[PDB]
């Protein structure tokens, strides 16, 4: 599970960085960070219960 969460993050961040290198506009890294934060919120809401 941790390996999958790491590989997906590594591929997404590299794709966003390639997009930044090419276009040079805005930041898909913001989208990656937002997705990570949403996943973190879901995880943190799933540990308070049994």
Curated annotation (Swiss-Prot):
The transmembrane residues are none
The places in or outside the cell where this protein is found are:
Cytoplasm, Cytoskeleton
| Similarity comment text for this entry | Belongs to the dynein heavy chain family.
This protein's assembly is summarised as: Homodimer. The cytoplasmic dynein 1 complex consists of two catalytic heavy chains (HCs) and a number of non-catalytic subunits presented by intermediate chains (ICs), light intermediate chains (LICs) and light chains (LCs); the composition seems to vary in respect to the IC, LIC and LC composition. The heavy chain homodimer serves as a scaffold for the probable homodimeric assembly of the respective non-catalytic subunits. The ICs and LICs bind directly to the HC dimer and dynein LCs assemble on the IC dimer. Interacts with DYNC1LI1; DYNC1LI1 and DYNC1LI2 bind mutually exclusive to DYNC1H1.
Q: What is known of its domains?
A: Dynein heavy chains probably consist of an N-terminal stem (which binds cargo and interacts with other dynein components), and the head or motor domain. The motor contains six tandemly-linked AAA domains in the head, which form a ring. A stalk-like structure (formed by two of the coiled coil domains) protrudes between AAA 4 and AAA 5 and terminates in a microtubule-binding site. A seventh domain may also contribute to this ring; it is not clear whether the N-terminus or the C-terminus forms this extra domain.
What does this protein do, in the record's words?
Answer: Cytoplasmic dynein 1 acts as a motor for the intracellular retrograde motility of vesicles and organelles along microtubules. Dynein has ATPase activity; the force-producing power stroke is thought to occur on release of ADP. Plays a role in mitotic spindle assembly and metaphase plate congression.
Q: Which disease is it linked to?
A: Charcot-Marie-Tooth disease, axonal, type 2O: An axonal form of Charcot-Marie-Tooth disease, a disorder of the peripheral nervous system, characterized by progressive weakness and atrophy, initially of the peroneal muscles and later of the distal muscles of the arms. Charcot-Marie-Tooth disease is classified in two main groups on the basis of electrophysiologic properties and histopathology: primary peripheral demyelinating neuropathies (designated CMT1 when they are dominantly inherited) and primary peripheral axonal neuropathies (CMT2).
Q: What is this protein called?
A: Cytoplasmic dynein 1 heavy chain 1
Look up and give the organism this protein is from.
Homo sapiens
This protein's gene is called: DYNC1H1
Residues of the whole record sequence present: 1750 to 1799 of 4646
């Amino acid at each position: 599970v941790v390996l999958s969460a790491q590989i997906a993050w590594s591929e997404n961040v590299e794709t966003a960085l390639s997009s930044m290198g090419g276009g040079g506009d805005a930041a898909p890294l913001h989208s990656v960070l937002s997705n990570v934060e949403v996943t973190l919120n879901v995880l943190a809401d799933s540990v308070l219960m049994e």
